[PDB]
């Protein structure tokens, strides 16, 4: 419902209820792991080799066919078994060339149960009895300073949780214009949220075809390794439209020139460096995590006056989200050629 003759100053920056949600989602994220398998018996010596493929001298393959000893359900007998792994999960322990897993010198790892999914769902927060939730309903409102038309509500609208670093996905659309928001734009150490109006459709796929293969470690244990790859060993990639992206940069340059003078050169560049999942951008597409080079978008400059863009990705299998000291998560491989369609909505 509505409310009149009323004005409240807001804040997004020293706001609460976001400080507890980053605790809530992590604390709830841990609960969907403890009923699942631990990988103590799998940190073991690996015997790896290249997958069958026409290999080049300069360029490199990205899949390693590895065989290893493993226990059975019984304790006396052992078995030899093999799987496929990525380059980003084995390191070389130091003729022959034998590897090991990457996270075994820091923490035992948790396989997620393949029954549970990681797809986003709507979450409506609600305030208990004796509180209220106000909502600014302004059109032109930079998120800081007094909103002139508030409206109370019982519960929030649809809030889905996604996970992405650059180019946040399935977001909330702006009303008419394109809005930039920040804490203090003359400062640089704070990020700049950019929320635009027309969503850029993004297709993302892996064209490779998998097979999962169950390995019994002991009683009631199932390591879902990757079986054989049928067809052409291909690289996962994403597509966006050329003209829509050239348009939506043209909108945000027109918006950015309000704070910086009309006679200003604005240009874009690739990320300056660091760890993996902040240089690229990450997302989960139906139960598998991508890391996709985004040099192909931010190569521009802007003067003060049928095709598409492909961009290639990489796939890790173990994640280390929120950079926790005693944590990893082996993800289960999924069947078939995989793709998903999303709406790029904001930038950071």
């Amino acid at each position, epitope marked *: 419902i509505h409310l009149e003759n009323v004005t409240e100053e807001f804040n997004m920056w020293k706001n609460n209820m976001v400080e507890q949600m980053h605790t809530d989602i992590i604390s709830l994220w841990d609960q969907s792991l403890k009923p699942c398998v631990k990988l103590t018996p799998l940190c073991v010596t690996l015997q790896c080799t290249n997958v*069958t*493929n*026409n290999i080049t001298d300069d*360029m490199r393959g990205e899949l390693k066919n590895c065989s290893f000893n493993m226990t059975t359900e019984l304790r006396d007998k052992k078995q030899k078994v093999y799987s496929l792994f990525y380059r980003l999960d084995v390191v070389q322990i130091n003729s022959n060339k034998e590897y090991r897993l990457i996270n075994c010198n820091t923490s035992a790892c948790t396989q997620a149960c393949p029954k549970v999914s990681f797809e986003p769902i709507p979450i409506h927060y609600c305030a208990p009895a004796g509180f209220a939730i106000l909502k600014c309903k302004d059109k032109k409102f930079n998120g800081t300073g007094p909103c002139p038309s508030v409206s109370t509500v019982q519960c929030t609208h649809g809030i889905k949780p996604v996970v992405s670093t650059q180019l946040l996905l399935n977001g909330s659309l702006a009303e008419e214009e394109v809005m930039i928001r920040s804490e203090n734009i003359t400062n640089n150490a704070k990020n700049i949220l950019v929320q635009f109006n027309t969503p850029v459709q993004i297709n993302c796929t892996r*064209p490779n075809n998998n097979t999962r293969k169950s390995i019994r470690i002991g009683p009631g244990q199932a390591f879902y390794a990757t079986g054989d790859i*049928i*067809g*052409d*060993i*291909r*690289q996962a*990639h994403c597509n966006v439209s050329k003209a829509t992206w050239n348009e939506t940069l043209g909108k945000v340059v027109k918006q950015l020139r309000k704070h910086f003078g009309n006679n200003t050169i604005i240009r874009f560049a690739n990320s300056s460096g660091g760890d993996l999942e902040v240089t690229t951008h990450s997302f989960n597409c139906g139960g598998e995590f991508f890391y996709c080079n985004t040099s192909g978008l931010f190569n521009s400059t802007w003067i003060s006056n049928n095709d598409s863009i*492909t961009l*290639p990705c990489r796939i890790k299998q173990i994640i280390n989200m929120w950079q926790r000291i005693g944590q990893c998560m082996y993800a289960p491989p999924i069947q078939g050629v995989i793709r998903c369609v999303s709406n790029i909505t904001g930038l950071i």
Partner: antibody
Amino acid sequence: QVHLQESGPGLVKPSETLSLTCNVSGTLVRDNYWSWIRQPLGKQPEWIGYVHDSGDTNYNPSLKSRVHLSLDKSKNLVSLRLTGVTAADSAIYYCATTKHGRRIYGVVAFKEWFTYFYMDVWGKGTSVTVSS
Amino acid sequence: APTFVSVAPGQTARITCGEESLGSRSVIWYQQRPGQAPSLIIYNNNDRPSGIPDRFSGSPGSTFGTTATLTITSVEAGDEADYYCHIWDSRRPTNWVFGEGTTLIVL
């Protein structure tokens, strides 16, 4: 109207620098990709490989050392040199042309394609005999 | 080594050759008349060049895990020649030798 004409010494002692020639018709040496193929008697042919002007000089890794192909822009021929003729070298030899083709299966920008070759026409041959 | 493709004339012959497929391929079919030079008959997976006769149909190269076949209909006495396949698999390396000969004899 294209056809070729092979010629070699014909009776070859072992451990000898073999050489071969190939005469052309209609199409000159500059125009098309060339190829030499051997075939033993009663056996499958062995594609020794292909050659072209300007750095298209890939060889078979089977021999890889004792074979060197050559061209003749002056007399308009295609020639071949082998080093160290062995007893298994007794095979009928074929100079021939071939045509390219780009088989594309994925994304072109990611080098997900490959070039294949196929011999359109053939020669006559010369039974190179290795013996004392 | 010579697989016997004894077929009655007017019937359909099916010649298999080469290794079982792994990736997307491109096959070339040749033939070898006795006493003569080779000659191409099929150059893509299902394409024959100009001037060549018809009735030499090729299997599509997108099938994953089969052997390269070649379908002939209505054979004759002039079709008596040894055959060779030449596969180009997009996973295995470069084939520096042809397939094994499948000789064709008409009834």
